[PDB]
Amino acid sequence: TALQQAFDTCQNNKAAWLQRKNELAAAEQEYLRLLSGEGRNVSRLDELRNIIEVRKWQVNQAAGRYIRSHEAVQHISIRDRLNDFMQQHGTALAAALAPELMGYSELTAIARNCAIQRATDALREALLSWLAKGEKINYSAQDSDILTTIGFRPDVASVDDSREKFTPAQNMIFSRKSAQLASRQSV
Amino acid sequence: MNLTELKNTPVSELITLGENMGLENLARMRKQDIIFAILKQHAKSGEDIFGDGVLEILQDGFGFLRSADSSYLAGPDDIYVSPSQIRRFNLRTGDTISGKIRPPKEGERYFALLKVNEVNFDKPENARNKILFENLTPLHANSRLRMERGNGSTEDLTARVLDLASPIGRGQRGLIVAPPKAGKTMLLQNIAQSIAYNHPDCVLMVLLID
Ligand SMILES: Nc1ncnc2c1ncn2[C@@H]1O[C@H](COP(=O)(O)OP(=O)(O)OP(=O)(O)O)[C@@H](O)[C@H]1O
Ligand SMILES: [Mg+2]
């Protein structure tokens, strides 16, 4: 039943990502209006720059964990669909690859690996032959709603900000600064 | 009048106004003595006078109140504070005080305190409910102080490179290692004026010894 857990994890990740996005937008717009304003508090400008950078780091991390959750839920859904599909029509699939599946129990490691590789090549050629004709399909009937509500792929706004990678020291110092921000804003 | 305006004035107009009101041959004595005589005459006239300053307590509660402008000189103008109000208001050394001041009577030569209207720029009852400095938890310098004024001053360079060499933050421990004839005094006053310009909110104090 981990599909529902993955779904709600993706939902709350999206909610947190939207919260980070809107708070970053508010911070940047107030920083811009203070820049255009008559105020000249340089300390305020520096602290606003610090807020902007820490919020950008938080948004990047939220996008990264959202991408991880989305790929995890997609993998779980694919695994479940393939599992029930093979439980439905797996005997015919095994018969279609019989010339390299007989007596798999006593085969050695290299023989088992080579047989698996040959089976993967066979199914890959079948899949490319199927995709050559371009026969359009839809989502799985049992879990169509989850796939539709999570989307085929995450939007660009969740990857365009996630294309920058931080060094581990940068991650640690940003985490410390975020903890300091939380401690100072709680009071 | 009040001690605040009296202290921060050159002795010229002070002695002229003292002569115009008329005290004595008020030329050959200390400035503190002149202020003391003027305050005594004004108190004898009958007008109430405010007072303000910084309070200190001796080992026996014999409290004094000095002024920052006079470099905390132990002159006669310092306000006497008895232990009674010290215990009543639960104040200690370093608490800025301001309020009515009692003129001295026979038996003492120091101005006393009638009542205090505020303590350390706060109400006397509100400032009592405060913890000591050592009871706080130290933290790193989160905020950043920038010496760049932004006006492109030709002499601002000494400050600018400082931001490129040693960032300044609130609540940090700063030390300067300087040999004689290194221009450290001008650098320090430049830092002080840059702080006063960029950050007028923060209280600035500059201490000089010998
Ligand atoms: N940028 C500068 N341009 C011109 N003169 C400078 C500059 N920086 C420093 N000086 C000179 O350096 C001299 C050093 O005198 P200053 O009083 O500033 O020294 P200090 O290092 O503060 O120490 P001390 O006063 O004890 O000698 C000044 O008299 C000043 O003429
Ligand atoms: Mg000097």
Curated annotation (Swiss-Prot), chain A:
UniProt-listed InterPro entries: Phage_P4_Psu
Q: Which GO terms describe its biological process?
A: symbiont-mediated activation of host transcription
Task: Print the keywords alphabetically.
Answer: Late protein
- Disulfide-bonded cysteine pairs: these are none
Recorded hits in Pfam families, A to Z, give:
Psu
**Function, please?**
Late protein which functions to suppress polarity of amber mutations in the late genes of the P2 helper phage.
User: What is the protein name given in its UniProt record?
Assistant: Polarity suppression protein
Swiss-Prot record, chain B:
This entry's Gene Ontology molecular function terms read: ATP binding; ATP hydrolysis activity; ATP-dependent activity, acting on RNA; helicase activity; identical protein binding; RNA binding
* Tagged with keyword Calcium: no
Biological-process GO terms, alphabetical: DNA-templated transcription termination
What the record says about activity regulation is:
ATPase activity is inhibited by bicyclomycin and dihydrobicyclomycin.
Q: What residues does ATP bind to?
A: G169, R170, G171, Q172, R173, G174, K181, A182, G183, K184, T185, M186
Determine if Hydrolase is one of this entry's keywords: yes
Q: Name one GO cellular component term.
A: cytosol
| Highest taxon of the lineage | Bacteria
Q: Kindly state which keywords UniProt assigns to this record, in alphabetical order.
A: ATP-binding, Helicase, Hydrolase, Nucleotide-binding, RNA-binding, Transcription, Transcription regulation, Transcription termination
User: Which effect does the record note for changing C202 to G/S?
Assistant: Does not affect the kinetics of ATP hydrolysis and inhibition by bicyclomycin
Indicate the enzyme's highest-level EC class: hydrolase
Known outcome of mutating K184Q: Improves ATPase and helicase activity but reduced termination activity
Q: Where is this region: RNA-binding 1?
A: 61-66, 78-80, 108-110
Q: Where is the Rho RNA-BD domain?
A: 48-123
What EC number(s) has UniProt assigned to this enzyme? 3.6.4.-
Protein role: Facilitates transcription termination by a mechanism that involves Rho binding to the nascent RNA, activation of Rho's RNA-dependent ATPase activity, and release of the mRNA from the DNA template. RNA-dependent NTPase which utilizes all four ribonucleoside triphosphates as substrates.
Comment on protein domains:
Each subunit has two RNA-binding sites, one at the surface of the hexameric ring, and one at the center of the open ring structure, where RNA helicase activity is thought to take place.
Entry's family note? Belongs to the Rho family.
Name listed for the protein in its UniProt record? Transcription termination factor Rho
Question: What organism does the record attribute this protein to?
Answer: Escherichia coli (strain K12)
Q: Report the gene name.
A: rho
Q: Which part of the complete sequence is present?
A: 1 to 210 of 419
